[PDB]
Structures are given as C-alpha cells and as structure tokens.
Amino acid sequence: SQVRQNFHQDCEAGLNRTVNLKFHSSYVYLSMASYFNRDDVALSNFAKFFRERSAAAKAHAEKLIEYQNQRGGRVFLQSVEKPERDDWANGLEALQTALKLQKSVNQALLDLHAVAADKSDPHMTDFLESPYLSESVETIKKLGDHITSLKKLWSSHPGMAEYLFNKHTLG
Amino acid sequence: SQVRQNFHQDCEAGLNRTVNLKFHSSYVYLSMASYFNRDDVALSNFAKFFRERSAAAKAHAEKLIEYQNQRGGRVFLQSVEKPERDDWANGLEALQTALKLQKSVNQALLDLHAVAADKSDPHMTDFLESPYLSESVETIKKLGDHITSLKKLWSSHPGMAEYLFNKHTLG
Amino acid sequence: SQVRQNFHQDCEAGLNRTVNLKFHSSYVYLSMASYFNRDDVALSNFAKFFRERSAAAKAHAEKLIEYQNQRGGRVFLQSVEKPERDDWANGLEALQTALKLQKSVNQALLDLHAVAADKSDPHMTDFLESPYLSESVETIKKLGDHITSLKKLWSSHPGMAEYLFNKHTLG
Amino acid sequence: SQVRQNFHQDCEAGLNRTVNLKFHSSYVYLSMASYFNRDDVALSNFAKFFRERSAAAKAHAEKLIEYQNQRGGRVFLQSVEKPERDDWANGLEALQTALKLQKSVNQALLDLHAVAADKSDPHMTDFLESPYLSESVETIKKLGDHITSLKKLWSSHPGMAEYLFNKHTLG
Numbered sequence: 001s002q003v004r005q006n007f008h009q010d011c012e013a014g015l016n017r018t019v020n021l022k023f024h025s026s027y028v029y030l031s032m033a034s035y036f037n038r039d040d041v042a043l044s045n046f047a048k049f050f051r052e053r054s055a056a057a058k059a060h061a062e063k064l065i066e067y068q069n070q071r072g073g074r075v076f077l078q079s080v081e082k083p084e085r086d087d088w089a090n091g092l093e094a095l096q097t098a099l100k101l102q103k104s105v106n107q108a109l110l111d112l113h114a115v116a117a118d119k120s121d122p123h124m125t126d127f128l129e130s131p132y133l134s135e136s137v138e139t140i141k142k143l144g145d146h147i148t149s150l151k152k153l154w155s156s157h158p159g160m161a162e163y164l165f166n167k168h169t170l171g
Numbered sequence: 172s173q174v175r176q177n178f179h180q181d182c183e184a185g186l187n188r189t190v191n192l193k194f195h196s197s198y199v200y201l202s203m204a205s206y207f208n209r210d211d212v213a214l215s216n217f218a219k220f221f222r223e224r225s226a227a228a229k230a231h232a233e234k235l236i237e238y239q240n241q242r243g244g245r246v247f248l249q250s251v252e253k254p255e256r257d258d259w260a261n262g263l264e265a266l267q268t269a270l271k272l273q274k275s276v277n278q279a280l281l282d283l284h285a286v287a288a289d290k291s292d293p294h295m296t297d298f299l300e301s302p303y304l305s306e307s308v309e310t311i312k313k314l315g316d317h318i319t320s321l322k323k324l325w326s327s328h329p330g331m332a333e334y335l336f337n338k339h340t341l342g
Numbered sequence: 343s344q345v346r347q348n349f350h351q352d353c354e355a356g357l358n359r360t361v362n363l364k365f366h367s368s369y370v371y372l373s374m375a376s377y378f379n380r381d382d383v384a385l386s387n388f389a390k391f392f393r394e395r396s397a398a399a400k401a402h403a404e405k406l407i408e409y410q411n412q413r414g415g416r417v418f419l420q421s422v423e424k425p426e427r428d429d430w431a432n433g434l435e436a437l438q439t440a441l442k443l444q445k446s447v448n449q450a451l452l453d454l455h456a457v458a459a460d461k462s463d464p465h466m467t468d469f470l471e472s473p474y475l476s477e478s479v480e481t482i483k484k485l486g487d488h489i490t491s492l493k494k495l496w497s498s499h500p501g502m503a504e505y506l507f508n509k510h511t512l513g
Numbered sequence: 514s515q516v517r518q519n520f521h522q523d524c525e526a527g528l529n530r531t532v533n534l535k536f537h538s539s540y541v542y543l544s545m546a547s548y549f550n551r552d553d554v555a556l557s558n559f560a561k562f563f564r565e566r567s568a569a570a571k572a573h574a575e576k577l578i579e580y581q582n583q584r585g586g587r588v589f590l591q592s593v594e595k596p597e598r599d600d601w602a603n604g605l606e607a608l609q610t611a612l613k614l615q616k617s618v619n620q621a622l623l624d625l626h627a628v629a630a631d632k633s634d635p636h637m638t639d640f641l642e643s644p645y646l647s648e649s650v651e652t653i654k655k656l657g658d659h660i661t662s663l664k665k666l667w668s669s670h671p672g673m674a675e676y677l678f679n680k681h682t683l684g
Contacts, residue, residue: 034411
C-alpha cells in the first residue's frame with residue numbers, strides 16, 4: 001500500500017479482531033432489545049436502551065473498518081457469532097450481562113492500545129483514546145449506576161421495580 | 172344493481188354480519204369506559220382508553236357499511252346486543268376481556284377474508300387486509316403488552332397497580 | 343403467547359431464516375463498501391452505493407424481527423456467516439455479484455410468501471408484499487440498469503469506465 | 514525564560530528543524546501551483562489543489578513557531594531551500610512527488626514525537642498528535658486515492674486523463 005506508514009502487522013490484525021468483537025456486542029444488544037419487546041416482557045424503554053447500545057457498537061465497528069483503510073491496512077471480516085442466550089431472564093440480569101460485556105470490550109481496547117504503544121504508533125493510540133476508550137468508561141459508569149438503582153427497587157418488589165425503572169430512568 | 176360486479180352473496184352477507192359484530196364491540200367498550208368513570212372506580216385513563224377502542228370499532232363498522240354500498244350490496248342492520256356485563260370488576264379483568272373480544276373479532280375478519288378469497292374477489296381481500304386485519308393485530312399486541320405490565324404490578328398490590336398503570340401507561 | 347393467532351410454526355421458522363439471510367446480505371455489502379474505499383481502488387461513490395444497500399438490508403432484518411414479536415413468535419438469532427470474498431475485483435464484478443445476491447434474497451422472500459399463503463395467513467402475505475417484495479424488484483431493476491451502463495463503458499476502457507460511472511451515475 | 518518548564522533542548526531544536534521543513538514543503542507546493550497555471554499546462558484545478566497544500570503547510574509552520582514561544586523556547590529561522598524542480602512534468606508526477614513529500618514530513622513529525630515521549634513531555638506529544646499527525650495521515654490517504662484514480666485514466670489516454678480529473682475530481 002502506497003499509503004502505509006508506521007503501521008505494524010500486529011496493529012492491523014488487532015484492529016480486525018476488534019471489529020468482530022464490536023459486531024458481536026451489537027448482535028448481543030439486538031437480542032436484548034428484541035427480548036424486551038416480547039408481549040410477555042413488555043418493557044419498551046429497556047428495549048430502546050439496548051437498541052441504542054446496539055447501534056453505538058455497530059457504528060464503532062464501522063469506524064474501525066474505516067481507520068484500517070485510512071492507514072493502508074486490509075480489512076478481513078470474520079463470521080459473527082450469535083449471542084449466548086435468546087432469553088435474558090429479566091431487566092436486572094440483562095443490565096448485569098451488559099456491564100460484563102462492556103468491561104471485556106474495554107479490556108480488548110486497552111490491550112489494542114498497548115500494542116500500538118509498544119509499536120510506537122502515536123496516531124493509533126490517539127485514535128483509540130478518543131472516542132473509544134472514553135465512551136467505554138462512560139457507558140460502564142452509566143450501567144453501574146443503573147444496576148445500583150434497579151437493585152434497590154428489586155429488594156422491595158421485582159414486578160414493580162422493572163415497571164418503575166423502565167418509566168422513570170429509561171424513559 | 173347496475174354497479175355490482177364480481178360481488179358474491181356470501182361476501183355481501185358476511186359483510187352485514189361483521190358490521191353487527193363491530194357495533195357490538197363498540198357497545199362493549201362503551202360499557203367499560205362508563206364503568207371506569209364511576210365514582211367508586213375512578214380510573215379516568217382506563218375509561219379514556221376504552222372510549223378510544225369504542226370509537227375505533229364504530230368507525231370500522233361505518234366503513235364496512237360504505238364498502239357494501241360501493242360494491243352494490245344491500246345493507247341490512249340487525250339489533251345490537253347489550254354487553255354481557257355492566258360491572259367489569261377491575262382494570263386487569265377488563266383488559267383480559269378486551270383481548271378475547273379483539274381475538275374473536277379478528278377471527279371473524281379472517282373468516283370473511285377466506286370467503287372473499289374462495290370467491291376470487293381480490294378487491295375485498297385487499298380491502299380487508301388494510302386497515303382491518305392490520306389494526307387488529309396491532310391492537311392485540313398492545314393489549315397483550317398492557318396485560319403483562321399490569322399483571323406484574325398486581326403481584327405486588329392491586330390497589331396501587333391500577334393507580335400507577337392508569338397514570339404511567341394509560342396516561 | 344396470549345397474542346398469537348393464526349401464526350403457523352413454518353411461518354415463524356421461515357421468518358427467522360430470512361432475518362439471518364438479510365443480515366448476511368448486509369455484511370456482504372459492508373465488505374463491498376469497505377473494498378471500494380481502499381486507497382488502491384478509490385471509488386468513493388461505489389462504496390457509498392454499497393453502504394446504502396447494506397443499511398437497507400439491515401433495516402429489513404430489524405423489521406422482520408419486530409414482525410415476529412408482533413405476531414407472538416419467538417426470535418432465534420443464528421451466527422452470521424462472513425462474505426465469500428474480501429476482494430471484489432472491480433466495480434462490474436461487484437455489481438454482478440449484487441444482482442445475484444438480490445435475486446436469491448428475492449426468491450427466499452417469494453418462498454416465504456408461498457408458505458404464508460399455503461397456511462392462509464393474509465396478514466403475513468400482505469406484510470411481505472409491501473415493502474419487501476416491492477423493494478426487491480426495484481433494486482433488481484436498478485442493478486440491472488447499472489450493469490448495462492457499466493458494460494457499455496467497459497468495452498471502451500475499464501479504467502475510464504469505473505471513473506466515469508462512479509462520477510456520473512453513482513454520484 | 515520564566516515560563517519554561519519541562520521543555521528539553523532536543524525538543525526545542527527539533528521544533529526549529531520542523532518549521533524549516535514545513536516552509537520548504539509550502540515552497541515546493543507553490544512551485545507546483547505556479548507550474549500548473551502556465552499557459553502550456555493549463556490545469557487550473559491542479560494548481561488550486563497545490564495552492565491549498567502550500568497554504569496548509571505554511572499555517573502549520575506558523576503554529577509550530579507559536580508553540581515554541583508558548584513553551585519558552587527560542588525561535589531560530591534558517592534559510593528556505595528552493596524546490597528541487599521548476600518543471601513538474603505532469604499531473605501524475607506532481608501527485609507522486611507530493612505523496613513522497615508528505616510521507617517524509619510525516620516521518621519527521623513521528624521522529625519529533627518520539628523525542629518528546631523519550632523526554633517525558635506529555636504536552637508536546639499531545640500537541641503533535643492533534644492536528645499535525647492526524648492531518649498528515651488524512652492527506653496521505655487522499656493523495657493515494659488521487660494517484661490511483663489518475664493512474665486508471667492514464668492507461669487510456671494521458672491527455673484526456675488530466676483534463677477529466679482536473680474537472681471531476683479536483684473541481
């Protein structure tokens with residue numbers, strides 16, 4: 001590539017692994033959004049919340065693909081594995097699964113950053129920091145706050161907890 | 172009728188039965204709306220909800236009457252039977268009665284569609300599909316969602332369940 | 343499902359197969375869009391065109407998932423297979439691959455329609471017709487027109503053909 | 514300097530070398546812009562393109578001079594060497610010369626970044642990353658895309674290639 005400069009193979013490969021990871025997350029959230037729209041779950045604002053997370057993860061995957069092209073790397077897409085579950089039990093469990101998902105995606109981004117740093121690629125570390133690393137920690141804080149608030153309500157009544165939270169926090 | 176063309180007697184008769192069915196539904200919802208406005212029930216948004224369903228069913232009956240005229244059939248109106256109850260117990264029971272009502276009306280519309288299809292009347296099947304069959308399934312999904320949400324609250328406290336739902340969902 | 347009515351298992355299953363098919367198409371177009379953004383291909387309007395097709399297929403998959411929920415079926419997501427190629431050769435070949443892709447997706451939709459018809463589900467046949475079947479034939483006609491125009495230019499000079507078409511037709 | 518803090522001599526010197534490099538680039542592009550305005554070349558949009566690159570490089574040199582003052586360093590200006598050529602042959606050759614020029618300027622910026630990093634100067638690495646390193650890679654990608662598009666047309670007819678590109682891409 002006539003454009004390629006100071007772009008290491010390990011950074012190119014790591015970038016391709018990270019887009020698959022982002023697509024996988026998006027698919028997971030899509031599953032959650034669809035689950036909450038079921039007539040027997042009926043929590044429209046939980047669904048909306050996960051639909052937004054799904055869209056955000058997908059956009060991230062797309063921007064990482066664009067970055068690959070801009071640096072002169074070659075995009076290699078892999079199959080996207082289905083979510084681990086089709087039934088997400090309830091709103092608290094879905095929220096907790098999302099926190100763990102976001103934390104593992106954050107770790108992958110941290111690891112990718114470390115490779116760019118080790119390879120002395122200031123352009124990539126800069127790109128990874130804003131907005132990827134920053135959106136990650138914000139989302140993690142928001143999910144953590146949400147889990148705390150829902151847990152407090154859960155202790156009183158789970159039926160009412162989900163209904164109230166869906167309305168006052170997610171709405 | 173100089174206008175009549177490819178309009179079978181069975182479709183004409185079925186159409187007349189369906190308008191009575193629509194008027195009967197409207198009357199049922201009117202009864203529900205009035206019940207929720209009682210000083211000892213006092214759930215103004217439940218009443219409003221059933222008042223809208225009543226108006227929608229009535230409009231449907233009117234449009235079916237117009238369709239009969241447009242195709243050259245003759246309208247025959249029958250007496251409208253009163254609702255089965257004057258007292259609807261509570262908000263959950265009223266909602267459940269409505270789901271069953273909507274499902275039987277949906278079935279009648281499906282049966283009517285099948286007769287039009289069997290008689291090779293593409294104009295009538297098309298007319299029945301949009302908006303009749305489509306509004307039917309949307310209403311059924313909404314009522315199902317509503318019953319799920321109210322049932323969750325019911326498990327905690329029925330008194331509070333109705334008050335909250337009337338305010339946050341129906342309002 | 344309290345909402346389910348006149349919804350056959352075969353229609354429910356077919357719907358789940360079709361969303362995977364739609365997601366697979368979207369992924370294919372994403373691959374094409376990314377390929378055209380490579381510094382050694384550089385046909386920004388071809389990329390834009392495939393990016394739009396990708397977004398359209400994804401939206402379709404999402405609406406089919408919503409339909410499943412509305413009828414009371416249960417969504418089961420499967421893994422999304424990667425595109426068959428990472429390198430798409432050129433603009434004419436990418437266009438020809440898309441026509442074949444659209445035609446097979448159209449066939450799957452026709453087959454699904456036939457199952458709904460056989461099961462006497464007027465709601466589903468109606469839903470499949472507009473906008474799914476209609477967007478399909480429009481896209482197929484547009485792709486066919488595009489292939490004809492590009493082929494005419496190709497016969498003179500492929501280098502210039504892509505550059506001109508990218509600018510005057512896709513731009 | 515009462516203002517100087519955590520500003521190493523090597524970073525101060527490197528900054529002065531980089532402004533000369535930026536001024537030299539600007540001068541090179543000025544030469545290219547003037548060449549394309551010759552009555553015997555007459556490619557007004559190629560000239561405009563190089564005129565913009567010239568202005569951008571000059572602005573960069575000016576901002577680096579300001580940075581030197583802000584950190585308490587002392588600006589030392591050196592003579593600006595003339596471009597290596599007065600005649601740039603054609604549009605493809607000028608474009609290729611620019612890619613190589615941008616890549617060497619990018620390397621100098623990467624080297625400067627590495628010195629700041631080694632000296633533990635987070636303010637300077639941050640300043641170098643945005644917008645210097647980022648504009649560099651964007652320009653390199655754009656020049657690469659341009660060379661690809663022009664090369665495709667060149668294979669058919671160089672006379673027409675320049676005329677079309679000057680109009681459809683650079684215009």
